[PDB]
Amino acid sequence: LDPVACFLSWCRRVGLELSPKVAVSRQGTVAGYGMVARESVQAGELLFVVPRAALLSQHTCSIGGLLERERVALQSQSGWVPLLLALLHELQAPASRWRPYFALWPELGRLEHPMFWPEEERRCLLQGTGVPEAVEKDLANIRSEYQSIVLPFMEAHPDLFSLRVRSLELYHQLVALVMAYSFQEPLEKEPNSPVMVPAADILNHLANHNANLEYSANCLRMVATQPIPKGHEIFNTYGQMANWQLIHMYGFVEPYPDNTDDTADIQMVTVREAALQGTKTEAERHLVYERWDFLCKLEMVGEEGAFVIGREEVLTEEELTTTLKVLCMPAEEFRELKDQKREEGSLTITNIPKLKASWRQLLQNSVLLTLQTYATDLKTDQGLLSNKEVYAKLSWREQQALQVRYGQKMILHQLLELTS
């Protein structure tokens, strides 16, 4: 309203140029603020430009020097501590060059990430989806970073960090914000740390998006990828995102069948398990592990990785095709490989039923094992979804979790049908 107007003056001050055809709005958007087309936009049309000096990063913030200087102290699993300190500093800075930008940020106490859910609810609603595992790892990292890194740094530089921002709760909120709002610029291998991109982080996300960001030497450009008719919301793409990643990172899901990018994971060791399960002999077991290790050498499998199954195609395609090949090939045919490229080809809805019986059976069994890791079967969730009035009576978190579980089980069950 006024914050929007203030933000737009700020844009002009810092050289951020919006097309007259786009409008920042809170009306008719899928969530919070979004951008809407004032006039129909053509594919390839420039929607806005953000100068690189307008970005909020460890490098542009007012303590960029101190942060760079202390880059070793500030290391972590995520690599976000420097950005989080820039944000923490800028938020308590009286004359922050980014105030009008912060004014459009969401209310930090109302973030929807499952990390803020009661632990039993998260654990129970999202079992088998991979979310509880990811959140648990996040929470551990967030807590260790705050105590051993972020809090002692702030206390070492009280001038730069008022007491009101020395907050564990706040640190959780800013991590969530970085997760949901930040951009990471692709390289070209030391991955670029995330930055906050004003205006660009106003756009909501869809699998079927109509805008995307381009990087250039001096600026970022948001460009239309599809024609956008008058009055229609402009949707960026946050990536090829399954619902389990959307809810974890962004606190939302796309309702079935909207998410054409949804996926289900089959843990790599589950495939191994299926292979072991089929053995009759302690000798047969050990020949399984030999095939496993060979795949670990090819870097096709690993103890904590997963195969990623898409709606029309397997995404970790060569990993899986090669895993099936090796685990299933005649024991003689294997010894000559273990002595003397990998397996090409697509794994799609049409291809899978044409695979060898042995590949399909191993896959079938792996999927059965995977489906057993959820609390209920697909029929239960399919029933909660099919009845709109039953669905409507579920809490918001229950609806979200349902969409995640349902999307995953459907893909798994489709794979079950394809492997007969």
Binding site: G79, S182, Y238, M249
Partner: peptide
């Protein structure tokens, strides 16, 4: 490493 790349 900050996730949303575009």
């Amino acid at each position: 490493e900050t996730f949303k790349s575009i």
